[PDB]
Design a protein around this ligand. Structure first.
Ligand SMILES: Nc1ncnc2c1ncn2[C@@H]1O[C@H](COP(=O)(O)OP(=O)(O)OP(=O)(O)O)[C@@H](O)[C@H]1O
Ligand SMILES: CN[C@@H]1[C@H](O)[C@H](NC)[C@H]2O[C@@]3(O)C(=O)C[C@@H](C)O[C@H]3O[C@@H]2[C@H]1O
Ligand SMILES: [Mg+2]
Ligand SMILES: [Mg+2]
Ligand code: NA
Length: 248
């Protein structure tokens, strides 16, 4: 069950962070759009004091058994956890301070003893900007709108352009999400609001040349139920186009 994992994630954070936990909120496809066949569960966690090396590994070990893994024919969904410190957000600075991350793309590192340390993250500005706009409080005495300062849209542009370089250099084995996120970056730069992946893809597609329109529309269907295979499509030509269109 999908509501079963969220209830399990709530218990792990509550009974291990204890009174250090201020609140737990979801953003992403859960609160805004609808969960598409291969969507994920995006959580934003706000705590009071920094976590220790031993406390971070506990989460990695406790979250692992209930999160889908890349390559599974499973009923579970990918669990994404991001932990921020409420005091480290004010005064607002870009990029903000990120305390912890749980990403299934980082799984082959979690197994080798990798423990994410306090690091800066421009992409977290985009995450926080859309989380503060709409989310689901699953635990906490407060709303996330009460725990964060108002994030200016100028820093969101900076986050888009800074986080763009990591995405374009890493589309391999993530072609469907890299194409759509670039489409979401192009719009957010020009329209302001955050758009679901399918709509943002369909919008930038019909605003693009035919050779790129078709590959974007091809990713819109993969984000939905379709089983697209990018083996002989050359996504590089399209992400370079979406890059230069975003770069301009
Ligand atoms: N313009 C943008 N709009 C939205 N997210 C953006 C944008 N630019 C970069 N991102 C990043 O893309 C990611 C979106 O999260 P995610 O992959 O979970 O998407 P989603 O909306 O939940 O859709 P789904 O989970 O179904 O694929 C975040 O890490 C966010 O910071
Ligand atoms: C913090 N944003 C992450 C980040 O962009 C990940 N890539 C580094 C991205 O990876 C995905 O696209 C994947 O394919 C793996 C999945 C767990 O998360 C998906 O969404 C993941 C995003 O939610
Ligand atoms: Mg999601
Ligand atoms: Mg995702
Ligand atoms: Na994948």
């Amino acid at each position: 069950n999908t509501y079963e994992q969220i209830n399990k994630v709530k218990k792990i954070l509550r009974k291990h962070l204890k009174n250090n936990l201020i609140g737990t909120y979801m953003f992403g496809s859960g609160v805004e759009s609808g969960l598409k066949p291969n969507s994920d569960l995006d959580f934003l966690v706000v705590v009071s004091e920094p976590l220790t090396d031993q406390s971070k590994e506990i989460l990695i070990q406790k979250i692992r058994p209930i999160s889908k893994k890349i390559g599974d024919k499973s009923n579970l969904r990918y669990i994404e956890l991001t932990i921020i410190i409420q005091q480290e957000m004010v005064p607002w600075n870009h990029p903000p301070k990120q305390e912890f991350i749980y990403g299934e793309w980082l799984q082959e590192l979690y197994e080798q003893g990798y423990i994410p340390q306090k690091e800066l993250n421009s992409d977290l500005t985009i995450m926080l900007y859309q989380a503060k706009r709409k989310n689901k409080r699953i635990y906490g005495n407060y709303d996330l709108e009460e725990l964060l300062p108002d994030i200016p849209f100028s820093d969101v542009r900076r986050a888009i352009m800074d986080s763009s370089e990591e995405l374009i250099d890493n589309y391999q084995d993530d072609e469907t999400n890299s194409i759509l996120t670039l489409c979401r970056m192009i719009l957010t730069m020009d329209t302001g609001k955050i758009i679901p992946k399918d709509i943002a893809g369909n919008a930038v597609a019909e605003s693009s040349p035919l050779e790129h329109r078709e590959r974007i529309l091809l990713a819109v269907r993969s984000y939905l139920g379709e089983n697209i295979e990018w083996t002989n499509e050359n996504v590089n030509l399209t992400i370079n186009y979406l890059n230069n269109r975003l770069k301009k």
